[model samples]
Target: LLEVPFSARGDRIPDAVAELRTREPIRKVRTITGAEAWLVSSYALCTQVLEDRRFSMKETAAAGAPRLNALTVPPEVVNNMGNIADAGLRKAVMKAITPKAPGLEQFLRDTANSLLDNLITEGAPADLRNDFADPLATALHCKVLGIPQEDGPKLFRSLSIAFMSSADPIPAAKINWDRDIEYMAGILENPNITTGLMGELSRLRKDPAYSHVSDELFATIGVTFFGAGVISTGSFLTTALISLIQRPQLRNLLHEKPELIPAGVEELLRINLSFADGLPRLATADIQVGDVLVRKGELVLVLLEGANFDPEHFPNPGSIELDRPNPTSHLAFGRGQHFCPGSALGRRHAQIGIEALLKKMPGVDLAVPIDQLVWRTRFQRRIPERLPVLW
Candidate 1:
């Protein structure tokens, strides 16, 4: 089995990609679990696989399936988007997470400012990942779900185990799954939860039109959204911060011309190294992807960096050009049927986050030597174990 994740380094994209992307855009590789998979590299083929319904993300959960990694939740949850649509909860979920929601941006701005305030007062050489990025993510997600902000610590405690990627099924995942479901289910009955996403979901649950909906589905929604959104948003912000600090010119430019920050954030998303592993999908039917034929039920991994850094698609892909005409073409939020429904809110989170950080610590830089920063391994997202920074 050829090794799966090319490198453990989070800040650097593997140099091997530039060569293999030209020679074998779609070729066989082995995951860390010793299972075979098709690694799709080129932007064209990556888009092809994501756009084709023949490649089933849900079926990746089938029993004894060849896996890119172990499933974190129950099998049925692999088709969460379909399930949400079937249960008539998609509209409510989409509406609840809209970045345009009144006061949401203000909430993010205020939240980030306060987090930064505590860090500044405490002095420098602080872990930005722990104190700033991840905490902000937990609070924002809590507010989005209409749950009390204090409940964040309870939900967040399990995520490190909840999001692990290993060969064997993690016992803690199931234990936490049951525990979190109970917590979410209990909230449905609380009078305090009559306001946010879960609040709207609670109202729909009682409406006679939705009597067929199961309590387990509602409970699953709460657990899944809160956990996954928090991980992705927080991880993205942390890595983006790393990338931003390394480029002093880009950092100063954004702080000086704040209007350029929106486009700057988009560029940041394009070059981000958040997803440590390729995004996995299973082919329901035989599909021809570039040079090879992916047989039914075979695992396929879409390498975001491969596509994002492909010079053919993105000229001079390594350099961040704020004026790039194809600014939104990158697969950062993903695409196709399973595109992250939380994309809008995630973008606004980063937008507000970058905005606040630059204003508060306009002279921020790495507190330690760059190479001294350790990287997290065997986890879905790529980020430093701790980001020590000073202004």
Candidate 2:
């Protein structure tokens, strides 16, 4: 139940997170769901839960099993996130996204340019969230999923406030999920799905071993991938831009060493509070992480901001270093079994998006005073509701 204060200079966060990690690796905290849960703030403890299969995602759906968020879906449906199990199957499901990195990069670059072209025509002092990130993300995600590009506007409209202020994310998620299932079902039925990730899912359905995967499962994958991917990528891109803008020295370093952008992106991932809190896990059995004994069925929240900023794992973790070794350890994509399948594509998209912003608007600056900008309060995302910008 700690409120992480916003920082214009991006300092103090590491110290605050470090204090929690050292003082109390796992402590009880009030969740947004209005339930008391154990928040795992230490690096080692977070890794322990992430790598341990015993902390089953499915088991969490039991009558008394610890729930993550107040998702509107029935407990069983929430717990039975089929893709959460079987590490091999999860990887297989993700191959559709990971293998198309090159194409994704090209598409993102084109998409960003198109958005910027339109934004520039409208002149400066426009919100980047509306003008660039949202449209670019929606268009690219829809295009990659083999969804009709024309439908981008509709999906974007559906999603614009879908998570913005929902106290309980489940209702909106359920609606979006249903729409995703319907849309993907159409793509699977269409003979024209001969390319992109959706086509791969279609081809997978034809395999004898994968025949057990239902249309619902395919649609679930599509829904989660498109919904989470576009939103997360859009927010991450916006946060990175705002951070770099506030710290011109860091921006200069990046400009001087363009090869550092990839590494810098990882550093930003480590430090940014894109995720409000960590994913919730149900402890199926007693587990000893460090000195703490976590009982079976205890709800555990992995505070990603706290874990990633731990100075023990990341020296000077609060400060953004363009070349931090093992930056991949940052759980921006989570870790182990639940590691994000769309991470590769996310990276490509973000790189292109940020690079285009810097290149097109080389001297882009905030159009208004920093205090006037509002931060999103709902959901796990930490994005500006609007990013008024000028060049």
Candidate 3:
């Protein structure tokens, strides 16, 4: 099935993508949800689909749309990118989270350091995921959304359950979804909350362009707490830390030349290799990616993980090379109109996290053999059960 979860092998790219790229860049495959879709497995083709407006994410939620998985976003928010009504709010949220937004970069750096400090104070042989990555991810996300720190734990709990409940029984998934809606609605209605992205979003209600945005759209934006921040960023941080720990020489190089941290972060993003199945899109009109002709209304899955590892683009694609001329060329962040608006903040968090670790906890090493580590493979998002490390 093309709808497989992320690779079990954490050290390298999944063999399935590599094999498909060589034989069939675009092939029909069965999704986990039992729907058939075109899976674009090569760099060129993935880019073509991602950049083309003919492939519509909005259409994916329509009736009869092929599903990549049972847990795709609710229709109300699925294609917010194409929703003309969301333009003003999207612009406002983007401005507040941009890296150059005053104090945002420093906020990330301080958060990284503070989290590391807490982990260090608690001593070594700690699970980085629970001790550092989880808290850091939640705190930073909450900070950006203007969610109260006290409310973060409960909100994260609901978000985690809601995101992972895709394969659960329908009733169970519905219950989780209901809880998520409640949490989002509570935050939106809270009058005391006057900061962060949510604060900015609430303030935009007076603007004529944003005045018509319904409560449904607000709830959709609120769920970004998980979609944009929690699971994926936490996974990236854990994976990046593992990459550095496995290469002592690289760690030393980064420690001595802190200037290379940003490039190193970019390379890590390219080589992290933990993508969920693929981004889902539906054809609005007939489209051709490579030699594969996709009929109108057909579903297409853009495998960004496969695209990032395309040998034609990244020589020695499986290996981490910080000096590569275009490490940033990789599509870990997707591309074109739907490109992740949070790319700058995501990169900054990883860069700052790695730099702080190398500076403070030199000689960090895995407490167990790499193969002995437990991994979370329940859903599309891949994460370590725990990253036990000793410094």
Candidate 4:
């Protein structure tokens, strides 16, 4: 029973992870897939497992490897991520979406402001998740990938269904997944948009280095970008807004001193419960993490949310401290070789979005009681299905 929804305590990590950190930092548990695995629950141990090369992300694709949930793509395709065969694709994506790309920061800022303008003009009692964060995230990712922004809403809907559909009723999820793949393929064939990541991907297909990659794989990469980039970032942005709307003092503090927004964003990332089940990895060799021994082929789930809140690393772990000295020390973007390549861009997106909301709607507050708000439980990540707000 190692079941922990992303934000079981309403924007907080379930208390079980905190208790486990103090009790069993490396405890064996049963995964949703019915496979036995070790749940690493401490900051020190979680880093060790993530940074150590002996633990293989690719191995997690092997037969019998545990998963938090079923992914749309085959496990092997997901595992082929860091290999040489995928290097060209990875490089192109990184180049296109990296925060340093010319005009990217301004683009994000303008996008956030524009979206807020529309929401403000539409009046109060709006669902921020759908009206603001979701579209902003999808549009930003689309701009980076060279996909037409007009297609964002459709892609977002398809990706959302693909992520939340359960294994028992697989056809619904499969249908959405196929639709997303088809959309990606259609974009790849479009010649007019030859500039961003999608353009780079098409160009790389003919390169000697990427010549081995298949068109299907390229389409898979596009879908993967959408899956990894859109909903998760949108969920995180919404979560950050919920926190700000709930804490007027913190919001005002940031509003007065806009210079502190970056640190505030890092703090938001620290406390964000977007990652519920933890990152899954497989031990390629026998490895001792803390006092527990994980044998080769054993699944190891690194509880990143648990690690971020470890009492040893973050003082007042349960509370949001915007000025925490080492705010970025948290594992929100992960670490080591698999660290999120889009971390800077992700942070910029949230920072700009937050700044825009605070500036445009300084008096914004929740439309309903905090506890009365509804949350989406269909997915592993616990996101507010509709973040209704009023100013």
State the TM-score for model 1.
0.98
- TM per model? 0.98, 0.88, 0.92, 0.93
Model 1, 1-391: lDDT tens digits are 5578887677888888888899999979999788999998889999999999888888888887799888878999888889999987888899988888788889999999999999999999879899999999999999999999999999999989888887778999999999999999999988779978899988888888999999999989999999999999999999899999999999999999999998888888888888988889999989999879899979999999889998999999999899999798999988898888998888888989999999999998999998998888888888888999999
Candidate 4: which pairs clash? Answer: none
- Whole-model lDDT per candidate: 0.90, 0.71, 0.76, 0.79
Indicate whether candidate 2 or candidate 4 has the larger TM-score: 4
- The digit string of per-residue lDDT tens for model 4 on 1-391 reads 6553324444656667788888899988775555678888899999999899788777776766665556655665666456423565666677887877788778888988888888888888888888899888988888888888898878777655666624343566678777888888888888786977888887777577766777778888778777688877898899889888888998999999999999888988888877657788889889888888889888888888778889899989878776687778899898887888778888988988899989999998999888876777656566777888999
Off by over 4 Å in 3: 1-3, 84-87, 165-170, 206-210
- Which candidate number maximizes TM-score? 1
Candidates by TM-score, descending order: 1, 4, 3, 2
Worst 10 residues of 2 by lDDT: 3-12
State the lDDT at 32 in candidate 4: 55
User: Residue 1 of candidate 3: its Cα lDDT?
Assistant: 56
By TM-score, the better pick of 2 and 3 is: 3
Q: Give the TM-score of candidate 3.
A: 0.92
lDDT per residue (tens digit) for residues 107-203 in model 2: 7788898889888898988788877887777877877777778877766665554444233554566676577568878888788886666877777
